[PDB]
RNA sequence: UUAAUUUAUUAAUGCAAACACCUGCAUUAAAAAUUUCGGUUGGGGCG
RNA sequence: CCUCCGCAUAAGCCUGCGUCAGAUACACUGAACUGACAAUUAACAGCCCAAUAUCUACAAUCAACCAACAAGUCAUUAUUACCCUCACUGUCAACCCAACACAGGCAUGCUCAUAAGGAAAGGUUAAAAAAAGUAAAAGGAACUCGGCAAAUCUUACCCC
RNA sequence: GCUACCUAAGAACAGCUAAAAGAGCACACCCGUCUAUGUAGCAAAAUAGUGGGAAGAUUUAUAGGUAGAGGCGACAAACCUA
RNA sequence: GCUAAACCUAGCCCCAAACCCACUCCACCUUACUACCAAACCUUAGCCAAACCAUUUACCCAAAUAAAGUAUAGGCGAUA
């Protein structure tokens, strides 16, 4: 039995408790110029206006038949168009919802109830998440930071079961996936893009009264995604919970309601999250990360109003990055 | 529905035996209904219908234990309506046809009120006798206005 | 093989613990994907008066005097309701028969938003 | 009780239909057929046994192309499927068909007695006489009920006044109206018969449960005793 | 023999009550209760209709009544439509010469070393590996999954030489587009309805192929006819359809000329996947609808003889075999069965790889054969490579 | 080894000795009838 | 409200008002050890966790994010002196999380 | 069952009725139904 | 020291070894006994879908060769209609069917020997008879209805 | 809800030999040849060993059907809640 | 002297008389106790008695009594 870990979530303060499972300190910020803008104007204005459809659209819908292809292609010709200016992108491996999978083991539990009561039992965690694309390659991105690097923000703890976040155990295959099989070439990874559902739309907590948990949302999507993929990563080179990594693994990820963008980089320090392991464990896991920015005010009839620039470019800097 | 003995001796096996009628789908025809049926008879009713001199004559004179058929109190219902009414509907634009056919029965005539009862069943009564005494409640308010119109009158006048 | 027991949501299989509510009144209607739409009108709203300055408490002094009792008549309501204002109108000037929609009264519910018979409001 | 006939569909197509077996049983639930149940699952092709059955807003004598030449689990027979216009539809095939082959399905009967090549489906007076024919209809326009069990074939033995004698496979002659339309030619699957089945469990397969244990005397009856005639049996040797 | 047993078939309505044939009186039923009775006769009820409008509980008005109802027939080729005759069925519809292997231009365009993707072989066998093997967590994944994903990723190698040709920053392509082509053949009504996604869209047309004596020499050639089968067949005949022509774009959009379309064979069943003519077919009707969609926006709704030919390619796989097709729409005028005709260079039957096998085959204790592709040829993705670069 | 023949099913308890059941014939209309006469607490499944 | 007939609804149609709730609510003391911002409750069987969004929202003008509901089977051991099996009642446990930290 | 008593049932046939079906009567078969299997003689066969 | 068991789902059961306080088929003054208190929180699962016509020949087996027979487990389109969202219910346990805390019956996934789960001996003595094993001089079926059992692992037939 | 048979839509079958099969050895699973134990028993039919089958006329979960003048039966007068 | 024993009254029985029942609210024929969608009438048989059994073998029908166990019926038997 072990924790079904939501990324995308509708649990309150969802961040802090991501944090804790997976040994992350939350640091606020980061670690052509006109083709650029036309290609991601004419990608938003495509899925808006242009292409033409033979059934009408309903918010319900919006999401998937508007927001996904839209970020779909911008990735796609973002990829294609600074090819040139980084090769590493050109031999790179681009996934269109490819699973990523990470099982570990956080902490110890006496079993309450049953005929195992009084049994000490380790806590597992799963994620599963489906990125809504993805960047591979051969090579690993180099670190942000060294590794023993000191942060004197301290990891939040909570004071009663995971179980109180709306979090809910279960026994299914134990899955290590970082998008691919080992036998793949692309082991490493480079930048994920992510999509909020359709169900933590901005307009939804507005109508709660999540007005703060709004943020929250996107930092819990990065903590648990990326922790899973560069953990996925680092367990794909041999290193375990014993056997703890030897070098920094890190990653980037871009996460879109479709309107607003975040930004967000991680760094794997330590694969070491077991009690035995974490007795005397100094290191720590490290999130970086940016407020949410709306790439565009509004789209008018055929022109996209108030598009912001440096939302653009800050996915370009991303997809520019290149190993040593 | 009864028993027979086997070979018309009570020595010999008793058994059950069935006698039915025999059936035909004949055509008769209503001249003061002034329709065509099609309707399952015996011999026996054509030979009824035969010493009644006709269809109508039967249906009237017949009571209801001897014709044993619903649909033949419905017949009797339908007949003694028409006559009670001198309903126009039997021959429009034709008055002597009509005065003639009510003439030749007019030994049949019956009030309105008892023809409409002739031929019911207890439930389709009990129906009826709902139907016609059920009206929606009165409001209170026009009771309450009444009483207190002829109070305050009598209160004016003295 | 428990007669006894109330038949309950948590007793069957899976298609019957689904089925089954605690008698919850609905609040929308399933689509296709098994998607739940919510109808905001169908949701109860309640009408939570303003409790500023209102000078009536929980409890009673105990020094207020008994009353005799006396239910609320349908005759009363209409003695001091309707009756002052018919009993005006025949003394002083005229009083129209049919024409009892100026006193309060409706000929029918259906144009109203609350009916009377059958009820279309809540408590 | 609960059951419900399979046999729903009200318009034809060629795509094979999901049917459900009986197992010998009636709509009662009880059994009225003894030895059918529980074979490999089956999928029903509808078969147009109306050669004859002209395209909406056409008629007279039409052509149609054989697309394929196939095995049918419900039959012994082979079945053609058969293009001609916008309609495809299923047929028996005959013994030599292949895809490709070009039949005709004519209403005409001729003065002069036609050629009658295997594929092509005629009235009976159109047809010569001692000509082999298959699917045949009791009535002009009712469709092939007779011959359309494999390698069966029909004789067309005389025609006298608008009417045909025909041989059905049991050696029974039948007589039929010469309006009444026929293929020519043996039908497909012959040396069906020659098919050895090897095996018990082959049976079981093509759905066929296992005969009664019970022993039974005889399948006729003995013959009544006359009055006179009982002190001649039952005679015993010394 | 009609279709449809008595016993499944609507129950007959139960005989009428003998009083309501006697004219003079009224019958008593339980329509004063509000329940059935046995005794009590059963009450006529006049048909009922919902004042208001749900949506849910929305009845369709008759097929007559619809707006879009025409007395004539179209013929509609949609995704869904597989043709009996394949190749041929397509050529008469659409009015086309076939020519057998792809145009020499075309070809030209990858015969130099230069225009090579580095590791050529290498990169394939990877695409290939990947889509067959390492896709997804699944030991083998299924042909729903691996042919769209290998597809996408042979454009994603494509895109790859960007670097040397500036022009491929040019283009885009686009998921979930729809087209439609309304036209006349021997007094027939034909619409192709063109849905599916991986549209390659460029703001430059394609050159011309074929020179003009090529186009006049197309006039010699004549549509060879199949009897007894109608062309009609296999296309949806539709009576409630709208006469209309659309590029699934509105107007000003950038990237407006159709350069290739991709279709997927992805169905995991054999029955569900088209026949390799059929896909054939598919792609000559895509083709030439996207084509005459470019055609009739450009020179309007009037039947000529096109002075600019419009040039669209194809690729249509099975995620294993890949049909090539280039299309050059000459003539709008289709009404004539002589005249000028259109053209097509179809290379099909061309597989990237024999074989896949995912887990290695093991005979007794020995390994036989090993896990990755098998009967892998790099000339057929130097032919897809070939069209990619076409204009470029 | 006999005595197991109850396997309990919910599905086959209702469709078998249900209340619907029970009224769907006559008879067992007049089991309920009996049962209700006789005072039964539990008139069916 | 409970034990009351709602009107039906059509599209369309009037929202759906209470004038007078009937159905009250107990704030409990949690047995195990919950968030700091959780607030457990004891609710009528009828009610949903709309209904207590809203009424908390609208009676006690307390801001509300999360409600979370689960049912509790009272126990049906207990015997009296006759062996006639004795119900503790189920009820509906509610948890709401509080807003605005 | 080749015991006795039946043909209520089914199927067919003929004669009435009715202008093929249904009904009444009779006949023939199938299918059953009800009931019994006295006493002496080792016990069993022939007596 | 054992593990031929375990963990989970399904089905079934329905609070049935959690806390506190009490009296008291081996016993602990403790129990699964009595009373009171507490608890299973949805993402998993259940609970689905406007209408009318219309479409759907080509298995699965790594689906590629090859080979079939018993012939197969999953496809739409056209037109009309359509804009509100995350409700309700299952979630506990040492558990079910066998009158029992019964050497029995009990579907599936994963673990194929365990990281999970358990204890054959209340204490003693070392009688007979009884049960299950282990070893046995010389002989090797002489036993017996019969090589039954055990050991050993075997030939050639006859009848059906 | 056992069982006999059927219907609908499902699931299971390691390893080794085999020109490849209602094939052989052999798990799981199904059955019950022979012996011993047990006989108010662990058990109103079980246990241990030894056995027969174990890709099929196979085994098995779910829902439905056939009802006593009857059902169902690879006839044992078998099974139809000990 | 233990186990025990002892008790009087809950209630019931037969009559008489008199013609009984029937909504707090909500839920309840679908898997009852679940707010909310496209069809009933139809001879009882048999045990039993006849010392077997095969025709037959009392069973309420409009209010006591008496006619009278009479006339009658019935393997003219049992019996009715
Ligand atoms: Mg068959
Ligand atoms: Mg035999
Ligand atoms: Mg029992
Ligand atoms: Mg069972
Ligand atoms: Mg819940
Ligand atoms: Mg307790
Ligand atoms: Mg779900
Ligand atoms: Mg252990
Ligand atoms: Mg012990
Ligand atoms: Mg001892
Ligand atoms: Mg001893
Ligand atoms: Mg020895
Ligand atoms: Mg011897
Ligand atoms: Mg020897
Ligand atoms: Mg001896
Ligand atoms: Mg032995
Ligand atoms: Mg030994
Ligand atoms: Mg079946
Ligand atoms: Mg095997
Ligand atoms: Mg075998
Ligand atoms: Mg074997
Ligand atoms: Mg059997
Ligand atoms: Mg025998
Ligand atoms: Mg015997
Ligand atoms: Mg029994
Ligand atoms: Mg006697």
Same mark, same amino acid.
């Given at each position: ?18 944090? @804790? ?14 083709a ?39 990735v ?19 996934? @269109?919802?490819c ?5 570990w ?15 000490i ?18 090579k ?16 939040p ?43 933590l739309?901005?307009?939804?907590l ?16 990065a ?28 990653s ?17 320090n ?25 790439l @565009? ?28 | ?13 008793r ?8 059936? +035909?789908?004949?055509?008769f ?7 065509? +049926? ?18 109508? +004559? ?49 030994? +049949?005539?019956?009030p ?27 409001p ?13 009158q009598?209160?004016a006048?003295? | 093989?428990?007669?006894?027991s109330?038949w309950?949501?948590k ?15 609905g ?10 739409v ?20 929980p ?65 | ?39 490999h699952?089956?999928?029903?092709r ?18 149609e ?7 049918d ?17 299923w047929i ?13 399905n ?10 009658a090549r295997?594929?092509?489906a ?25 011959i ?10 005389r025609?006298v ?18 309006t ?20 018990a ?38 | ?11 007959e309505?139960?005989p ?58 179209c ?20 009015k ?19 225009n ?7 990169? =394939?066998?990877?695409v ?36 040397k ?32 996604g991986?549209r ?7 050159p ?16 060879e ?17 709208? =006469? ?6 509105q ?32 792609m ?21 003889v ?10 249509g ?22 005249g ?30 090993? =896990? ?11 032919k897809?490579?070939?069209?990619y670069?076409?204009?470029? | 080894?006999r ?39 539990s008139?069916?499944? | ?27 409990v ?9 959780t607030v457990?409750?004891?609710i009528?069987?009828?009610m ?23 049912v ?5 051991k207990?015997?009296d ?21």
């Open positions: 039995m072990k924790y079904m870990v939501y990324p995308q979530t509708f649990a309150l303060n969802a961040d802090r408790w991501y944090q @804790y499972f997976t040994k992350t300190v939350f640091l606020s910020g980061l670690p052509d110029l006109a650029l803008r036309a290609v991601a104007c004419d990608c938003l204005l495509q899925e808006h206006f242009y292409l033409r459809r033979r059934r009408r659209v309903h918010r319900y819908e919006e999401s998937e038949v508007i927001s996904l292809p839209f970020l779909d292609q911008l796609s010709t973002l990829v294609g168009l600074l090819s040139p200016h980084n090769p590493a992108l050109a031999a790179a491996a681009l996934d @269109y919802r699973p990523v999978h990470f099982y083991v956080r902490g110890e539990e006496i079993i309450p109830r049953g005929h195992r009561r009084g049994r039992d380790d806590l597992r965690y799963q994620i599963d998440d489906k990125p809504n694309n993805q960047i591979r390659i051969s690993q991105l180099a670190e942000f930071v060294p590794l023993d690097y000191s942060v004197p923000i301290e990891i703890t909570i004071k009663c079961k995971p179980d109180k976040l709306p979090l809910f155990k279960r026994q299914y295959e134990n899955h290590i996936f970082v998008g691919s099989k080992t036998a793949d070439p692309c082991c490493y990874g480079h930048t994920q893009f992510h999509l909020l559902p359709d169900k739309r901005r307009e939804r507005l109508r709660q009264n999540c007005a703060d948990q709004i943020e929250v949302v996107f930092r819990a999507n903590i648990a995604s990326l922790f899973a993929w560069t953990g996925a990563q680092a367990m794909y080179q041999g290193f375990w919970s014993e056997a703890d990594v030897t070098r920094p693994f890190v980037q990820a871009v996460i879109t309601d479709g309107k607003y963008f975040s930004f967000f980089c991680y760094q794997l330590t694969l070491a999250l077991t009690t035995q392991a974490d007795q005397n464990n100094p290191r720590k896991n490290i999130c970086w990360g940016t407020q949410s920015k709306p @565009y005010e509004t789209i008018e009839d055929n022109d996209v109003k108030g598009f912001n620039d440096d939302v653009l470019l800050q996915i370009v800097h991303f997809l520019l990055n290149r190993p040593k | 529905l009864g028993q027979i003995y086997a070979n018309n001796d009570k020595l010999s096996k058994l059950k035996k069935v006698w039915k009628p025999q059936l +035909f789908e004949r055509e025809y209503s001249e003061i209904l002034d329709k065509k +049926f099609t309707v399952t008879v015996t011999m026996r009713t054509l030979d009824l219908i035969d010493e009644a001199y006709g269809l109508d +004559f039967y249906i009237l004179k017949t009571p209801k234990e001897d014709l044993c058929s619903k649909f033949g109190m419905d017949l009797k219902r339908g007949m003694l309506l028409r006559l009670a009414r001198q309903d126009p509907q039997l021959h429009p634009e034709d008055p002597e046809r009509r005065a003639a056919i009510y003439d030749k029965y007019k030994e +049949f005539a019956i309105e009120e008892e023809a409409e009862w002739v031929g019911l069943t207890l439930e389709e009564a009990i129906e009826k006798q709902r139907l016609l005494e059920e009206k929606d409640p009165v209170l308010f026009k009771i309450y206005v009444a009483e207190l119109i002829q109070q305050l009598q209160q006048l003295s | 093989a428990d007669r006894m109330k309950t949501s007793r069957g299989p899976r298609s019957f613990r689904g089925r089954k509510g605690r008698g919850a009144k609040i929308g209607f399933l689509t296709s994907g098994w998607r739940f919510q109808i905001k009108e169908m949701v109860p709203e309640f009408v939570v008066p303003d409790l500023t300055g209102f000078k009536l408490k409890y009673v002094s105990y020094l207020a005097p008994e009353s005799e009792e006396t239910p609320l008549t349908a005759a009363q309501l209409f003695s001091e309701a309707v009756a002052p204002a018919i009993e005006k109108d025949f003394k002083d000037g005229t009083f129209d028969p049919d024409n009892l929609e100026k006193y309060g009264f409706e000929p029918t519910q259906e144009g109203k938003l609350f009916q009377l018979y059958p009820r279309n409001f809540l408590r | 009780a609960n059951f419900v006939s399979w046999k729903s569909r009200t318009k034809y197509t060629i795509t094979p239909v999901k049917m459900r077996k009986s197992g010998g049983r009636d709509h009662t639930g009880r059994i009225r057929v003894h030895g059918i149940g529980g074979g699952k089956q999928r029903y509808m078969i147009d046994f109306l050669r004859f059955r002209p395209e909406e807003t056409k008629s007279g004598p039409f052509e192309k054989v697309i394929q030449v196939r095995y689990p419900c039959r012994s027979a082979d079945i053609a499927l058969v293009a001609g216009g916008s309609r495809k539809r028996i095939a005959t013994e030599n068909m292949q895809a490709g082959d070009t039949i005709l004519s209403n005409h009967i001729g003065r002069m007695a036609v050629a295997e594929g092509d005629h009235p009976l007076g159109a047809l010569p006489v001692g000509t082999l024919i298959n699917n045949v209809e009791s009535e002009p326009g009712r469709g092939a009920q007779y359309r069990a494999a390698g069966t074939c029909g004789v067309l033995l025609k006044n608008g009417t045909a004698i025909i041989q059905l496979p049991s050696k029974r002659q039948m007589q039929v109206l010469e009444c339309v026929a293929t020519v030619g043996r039908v497909s699957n012959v040396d069906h018969n020659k098919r050895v089945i090897g095996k469990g082959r049976n079981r397969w093509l759905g066929k449960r296992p005969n009664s244990g019970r022993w039974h005397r005889k399948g006729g009856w003995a013959g009544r005793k006359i009055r006179p005639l009982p002190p001649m049996k039952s005679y015993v040797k010394l | 023999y009609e279709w449809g047993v008595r016993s499944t078939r609507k129950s309505p139960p009428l009550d003998r009083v309501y044939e006697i004219p003079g009186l009224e019958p008593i039923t339980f329509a004063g209760k509000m329940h059935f009775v046995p005794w009590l006769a059963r009450p006529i009820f006049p048909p009922w209709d919902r004042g208001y409008k749900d949506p849910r509980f929305y009845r369709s008005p008759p097929l007559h009544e619809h707006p879009l109802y025409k007395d004539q027939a013929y509609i080729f949609h995704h869904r439509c597989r043709l009996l005759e394949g190749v041929k069925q397509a050529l008469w519809l659409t086309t010469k076939l020519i057998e292997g792809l145009p020499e231009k075309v070809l030209s365009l990858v015969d130099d070393p230069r090579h993707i580095e590791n050529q072989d290498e990169c =394939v066998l990877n290939i590996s990947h889509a067959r093997l390492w896709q997804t967590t699944e030991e083998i994944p299924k042909r729903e999954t691996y042919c769209p994903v290998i597809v996408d990723n042979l454009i994603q190698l494509c895109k790859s030489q960007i670097l040709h500036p022009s491929l920053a040019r283009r885009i392509c686009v998921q979930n587009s729809t087209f439609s082509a309304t036209w006349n053949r021997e007094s027939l009504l034909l619409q192709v309805r063109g849905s599916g991986a390659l869209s460029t703001k430059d047309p394609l011309t192929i074929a020179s003009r004596e090529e186009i006049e020499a197309t006039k010699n050639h004549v549509l006819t199949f009897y007894p089968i109608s062309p009609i067949i296999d296309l949806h005949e539709c009576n409630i359809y709208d =006469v209309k022509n659309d590029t699934g774009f107007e000003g959009y950038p990237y407006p000329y159709p350069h290739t379309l991709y279709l997927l064979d992805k169905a995991n069943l054999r029955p569900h996947r088209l026949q390799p003519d059929q896909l054939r077919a598919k000559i009707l895509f083709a030439f609808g996207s084509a005459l969609a470019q055609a009739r926006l450009l020179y309007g709704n009037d039947a000529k096109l002075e600019q030919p419009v040039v669209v390619q194809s690729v796989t099975d995620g294993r075999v890949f049909h090539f097709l280039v299309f050059q729409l000459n003539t709008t005028d289709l009404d004539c069965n002589e000028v005709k259109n053209l097509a260079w179809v290379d099909s039957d061309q597989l990237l790889y024999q074989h896949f096998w995912c887990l290695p085959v093991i005979k007794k204790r020995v390994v036989v054969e090993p =896990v990755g592709p098998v009967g892998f040829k790099p000339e057929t993705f130097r897809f490579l070939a069209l670069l076409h204009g470029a | 080894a005595g197991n023949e109850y396997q309990p099913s919910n599905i086959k308890r209702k469709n078998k000795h249900g209340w619907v059941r029970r009224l769907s014939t006559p008879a067992g209309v007049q089991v309920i009838l009996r049962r209700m006469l006789k005072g039964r607490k008139l069916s499944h | 409200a409970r034990n009351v007939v709602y009107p039906l609804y059509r599209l369309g149609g009037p929202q759906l008002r209470v004038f007078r709730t009937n159905f009250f609510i107990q704030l003391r949690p047995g195990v050890a919950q968030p700091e911002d457990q409750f004891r009528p069987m009828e949903t966790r709309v209904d207590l969004r809203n009424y908390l929202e609208g009676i006690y003008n307390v801001p509300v994010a999360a409600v979370r509901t689960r509790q089977h009272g126990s049906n207990r015997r002196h006759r062996n006639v099996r004795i119900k503790k009642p189920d009820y509906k446990v509610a948890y709401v999380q509080l807003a605005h930290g």
